[model samples]
Target: SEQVDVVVVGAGFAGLTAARAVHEAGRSVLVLEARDRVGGRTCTEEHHGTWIDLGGQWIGPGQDRVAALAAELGVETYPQPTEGDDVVLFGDGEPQRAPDVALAFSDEELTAYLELAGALEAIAEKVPLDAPWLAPEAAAWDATTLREWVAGTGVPDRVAGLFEVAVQAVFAATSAQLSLLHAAHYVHSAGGWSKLTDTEGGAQQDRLVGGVQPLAERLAARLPDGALRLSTPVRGLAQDGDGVTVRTAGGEVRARRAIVAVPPTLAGRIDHDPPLPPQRDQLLQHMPQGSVVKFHVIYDEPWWRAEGLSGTVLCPDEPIGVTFDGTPPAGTPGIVTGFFEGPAAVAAGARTREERRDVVVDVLARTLGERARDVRDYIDRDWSAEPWTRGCYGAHLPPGAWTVYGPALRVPVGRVHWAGTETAERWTGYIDGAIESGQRAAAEVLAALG
Candidate 1:
């Protein structure tokens, strides 16, 4: 039996970071990964020499943790384009091209939705980032769905519709699927709703020059020989008096501590000895993944740019919720990445690839024009079908999960600790937050060892 100071499961951003931290601290560490590749939720593919990011791949000003890590790794970044007109597809309406999303709505509708956004931000600000369940109205908010809370506001269809698009695009789940408090905590973690939605100054502000997968690759490179193990899926984890034994397909590794850094759902799949507490088990059951299918359509050139389009589209009533120009900074072989999120993504899971592609291509045709069909290639990743991840962008809390079991999220069990993007307080569900969580976990285990 191999032994180490620490064992990290799932070699994504969080797990790799934890291993890197422990390795640098002069402690022996090992990273166990199921897949042959690293980066977890972040996957980068290449189409005709141009990089296509099929997973989590964006950062902005406030995402300091990841930004600093990238800077240290010499991972350059470029701003996502916001120069061209944005297209909007509303309920049974034709594609409307406008300078901004707000311009697509009537003056009164604009004011109404802006006020609603402000209200949501205000409510979110009141929820503490670390312990959202401790908020004054946490019980009521956690028990309510986001859709229910929005409907209670009595906003008009236009205002409601606009927000619906934003929520679906941002959360990868419908408002009906998310608890009101989870929604608020997400916004609070991002600092504001606008910060989550905007391209220039928000979460979608920038992209790595290559792709985000390299970030994990870089982190893994820092480990000692044989420390990072790929294609080694951990089947079970058992904790005893002295340490935790990590059981994998090949063999077992004994470590003083263990960090299971995968998504809550995937982590739950791992058999644990002495069974996790009821709260943790129930929390894992209630927190379901936010469905998302990230894809990219390649073209010989950026034809949309020629027509004064930013290659960005927001469709509230389509299977494809949103899109953006994924062209590399070098600007050749244009690619537009799109996401099928929320209910659409769930429905898409059942449909055939050709059918889904036809739907997406039609959406492209409607917004960009018939010329959109002249695609050179198309690639996509539906994380739901992926065995290890189960889904992408992490999970979302349904009604009542938070108030009942929120405290179990970060609390370690015996020799096991928790670390993942979802466990973060600042940028929760983003790469930056994944780093933050790993930092915290590393500190916890390092302190315990001493």
Candidate 2:
């Protein structure tokens, strides 16, 4: 096998970005992806003459990497419409206009709600915009889970439900399962919980003005033919003093360095030669993947809009926690995308695709009333079923896991390094985090090579 200077695994944004950096630095590089396509989770699926982004759907102004790349590639972006009033539904309950119920709460309840909101903001503010958990102040908070922290805040039922919804949307897991510290850290990484909410943060939605696929395609275009290998699963790796050798279905490729850009759940499949130190192995074993799924269903028209709704719905404790106006292809019928968190995702994944579509439509109908019943076609993308992804974006740390193995996530192991959204302390489970980690990992590799 011809020795390459670098073997970048996974063709996601991170891998592509890393490959570009290495190639520019005068290093020979190869990009190996498991799927038949280039984008790991950023692929745009065309259904019923509409384009839907099943993965990495939302990008904010704070995301410099995505912004710069979009600019360089001539990809335009527009503000996500925040117009119209939205509805709020309680756990497995019926939906109601957010304004309708705003006056329903008593002063005490409102106070509790505001207090909880304030604490979350404080938590978010404290987290470093870059390395959140790594920040020294995060140590004391890391000991508790979000559920515990919310409980400590003495928040009322109504307000607690809002926090619960945020957790569901962001972590894609139950509040009980995630660390409160990490949740706060995520909020901070995002500039605060309210900043992410429409009412408080305003409508901050942006997609590739052209589409996400173009961004991916543009990155691939810069690489040499045969440099980007698709449909190639990286089985494992063998690393020594000189270089690292990657094992894939296609065969082995030896390189001076390698970057494993994959979700935590699937990380175990890749064997690290000489084995990762005990702590690193432990982090891999304990790091949990967030189970969230995004579903895009097309209807005959934008029926929800007719009802004076802003195309956003929130259902607490329900399988479908949130729904939004999906960026369907222009001239296509109205298409709406729904987000499912934790158990909802598990339930959705358990059903067949058709069944899942039916379930989603039913939820929409219930939320939007008779208007939602008028639908045309339905489709969705289940991340859990993807062989390469295994699960959604978020990563969870088991009890005592962070204290024991968290340190290993940042350390370099032999010639193999780690760069993924999860390993990032800043954005952790977001696209922004992926960019931060990818850039950092690229710099690390370049420095080591020097």
Candidate 3:
């Protein structure tokens, strides 16, 4: 067995960041990744000579960590185009071009939606960014599900459906799967509900010029040769009073400390010699990965743009919840990206690839026009089907999990430390959070070793 100062499991943003920090501290570090590629939940795929992100893609203002890292790596970014009127398709209603800053809904439904947004914003404000579980009403808030909270608000059915769609798009899971406290914490972490959900000034403000995966790849590239081991999945981890042992298919590595940077749900898959604490085990069990299927439809040109449309479509009734213009900077052969989330994603994930493709393409036809059917290429990535990840975005806290187990999430057990986007204090599920958590874990390990 080989010995190193530190071993970082998983090569996503968190793992790579941890490894880089350890290396900069003059400690030997090794990164073991299960997949052949480096980026974990972020990947770039090529279609018709254009590269697109199949995983976590967007970064905007307030995500300073990731933005600074991108600049450090010399990665370029561009604002998402949102110039023309957006299209909205309500329940079986004809698609209508929505006025700027307004959704296509009746006055009553719009009023309910705005009121609900304000209510959520108020709740979010009460949840502390650093310790949401410590909120005054954390227990009461955590006892209920987001779905229960929204339903009890007595919003119109249309407004309820719209909120459900928004929840699915934000977390990749239905409201029923999330706790009220967790939802509010997420909103607060992003500064506000509007910042979390909007495009222009919100979380989805910008895209990497090529793709987001390069951020991880570039970080890994900066590490010394032989430090990163691809296709090496850790099977077992054992820690003693002095050091830790990590077992892989190929061999075992002994290090003073280790950072498990995979998602909390996936981390439970590895067998521990003495086993993790009961609270930690319970927390991991309840932190289920959110479901989402991302797809892209290629067209000869951005026909909707010429029709005075922004190429952004929101269909609350369809399996495709939202569609955005993924047109490359080159501006030829426009690409429209769509998401199937929550219950819709669960159902779509169960169908054959061809069936799901047909369903999404049909939705595009109905929402964008017949021109949408004339696609030159169609590509989709179902994160649920991936064995390593099992789902996309990140994991979430259900009712009561936060108050009961949130503190144990980042607490180190023996010589092992946890680092993932979900463990971040701010920007919890974004790439920025992942980087922050990784650096924090690295610091923890250094202090412990000293």
TM-scores, all models, native as reference = 0.98, 0.92, 0.98
What ordering of candidates by TM-score runs from best to worst?
1, 3, 2
What is candidate 1's lDDT per residue for 1-450, written digit by digit as tens? 999999999898999988899888999999999999999899987678967788888999899999999999999999998888989998876889998878999988888888888888888998999999998999999989999988998888978987998898888888999999999999999989888999988999999988999888988899988998899999999998899999987789999999999999988989999799999999999889889888888888888999999998888777887899888877878888888987788788788777777888999999988888998888888889899888877899999988898889999999999999999999998999999999999999999889
Report the error of model 1 at residue 38, Å.
0.8
Where model 2 places Cα greater than 4 Å from the true spot, the runs are 91-94, 98-110, 127-140, 199-204, 327-331
All candidates in order of lDDT, best leading:
1, 3, 2
Regions more than 4 Å wrong, model 1:
none
Candidate number achieving the greatest TM-score relative to the actual structure:
1
lDDT of 3 at 71: 97
To one decimal, what is the Cα RMSD in angstroms of model 1 from the true structure? 1.0
lDDT of 2 by residue, 8-107 (tens): 8888877888788788888898988888887677877666665567787667756677778778887777566455556777764456775433443568
For all candidates in order, the CA lDDT equals 0.89, 0.73, 0.89
